[PDB]
C-alpha cells in the first residue's frame, strides 16, 4: 500500500523528468545528469517545473496507496492542444530484498524511455504536457475529449514488469500524423 505508492511516486517523478527531456518539451539547458536506479537520467533544475511535477504526484499518491489508479499518463500536447504522444503507465497492485528487486526492474523502464526517441518521430515545436490519471491549492478537473482524443495512434510497447507487489506496463501512443 504505502510502500508501493512511495516507490511508484518516486519512480514516476524520475520518469516524468526523463520524458520531458527526451521528448524536448523543455530546453536541454534546464536538465542535469543524475543517477537513479543505478542508471543515468536527466532531471530538471528549474524550481517551478519541479514543484509542479511534485505537486502532481503528491496528489496521485493517496490514490495509489488505496489502489485506485488504473493508469497514469504523461501527455505531450502541441501548440494547438492536440495530444501528440502519450506515455501510458498502466498499473496493477496484485494480491527477501523486495525493494532492491523492484528497483532493478524499474531501471528497465528508465532505460527504455531514455532511448524511445529511436522509435518516435520528432514532436512539433512548442509542445507542452499534462498528466492524466485514470481512476478505478492543486485542483484537479475531469479531462475533456480534447485532452484525450488522439487521431490514428500508433502503439509502441516500451516495457512490462511483474512483481509480488506491482505489475506495470509502459507503452507510448504516438499520433501517426503530428503535422510537421
Amino acid at each position: 500500500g504505502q510502500v508501493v505508492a512511495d516507490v511508484l511516486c518516486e519512480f514516476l517523478e524520475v520518469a516524468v523528468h526523463l520524458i520531458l527531456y527526451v521528448r524536448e518539451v523543455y530546453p536541454v539547458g534546464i536538465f542535469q545528469k543524475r543517477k537513479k536506479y543505478n542508471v543515468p537520467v536527466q532531471m530538471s533544475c528549474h524550481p517551478e517545473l519541479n514543484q509542479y511535477i511534485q505537486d502532481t504526484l503528491h496528489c496521485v499518491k493517496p490514490l495509489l496507496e488505496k489502489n485506485d489508479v488504473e493508469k497514469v499518463v504523461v501527455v505531450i500536447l502541441d501548440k494547438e492542444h492536440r495530444p501528440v504522444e502519450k506515455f501510458v503507465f498502466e498499473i496493477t497492485q496484485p494480491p527477501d530484498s523486495l525493494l532492491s528487486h523492484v528497483e532493478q526492474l524499474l531501471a528497465a523502464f528508465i532505460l527504455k524511455i531514455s532511448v524511445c526517441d529511436a522509435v518516435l518521430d520528432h514532436n512539433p515545436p512548442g509542445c507542452t504536457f499534462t498528466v492524466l490519471v485514470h481512476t478505478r491549492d492543486f485542483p484537479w478537473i475531469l479531462a475533456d475529449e480534447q485532452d484525450v482524443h488522439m487521431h490514428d495512434p500508433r502503439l509502441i510497447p516500451l516495457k512490462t514488469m511483474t512483481s509480488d507487489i506491482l505489475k506495470m506496463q509502459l507503452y507510448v501512443e504516438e499520433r501517426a500524423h503530428k503535422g510537421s
Binding site: 530546453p27 507542452t128 499534462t130 492524466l132 490519471v133 485514470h134 492543486f138 478537473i141 484525450v148
Partner: peptide, 21 residues
C-alpha cells in the same frame, strides 16, 4: 470520460522558462 482526471493548473510554459534564462 468519467474517471480521467488532470491538474487544473498547467505547467510553466517553455516560453515562461526561457524568459528567466
Amino acid at each position: 470520460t468519467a474517471n480521467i482526471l488532470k491538474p487544473l493548473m498547467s505547467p510553466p510554459s517553455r516560453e515562461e522558462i526561457m524568459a528567466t534564462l
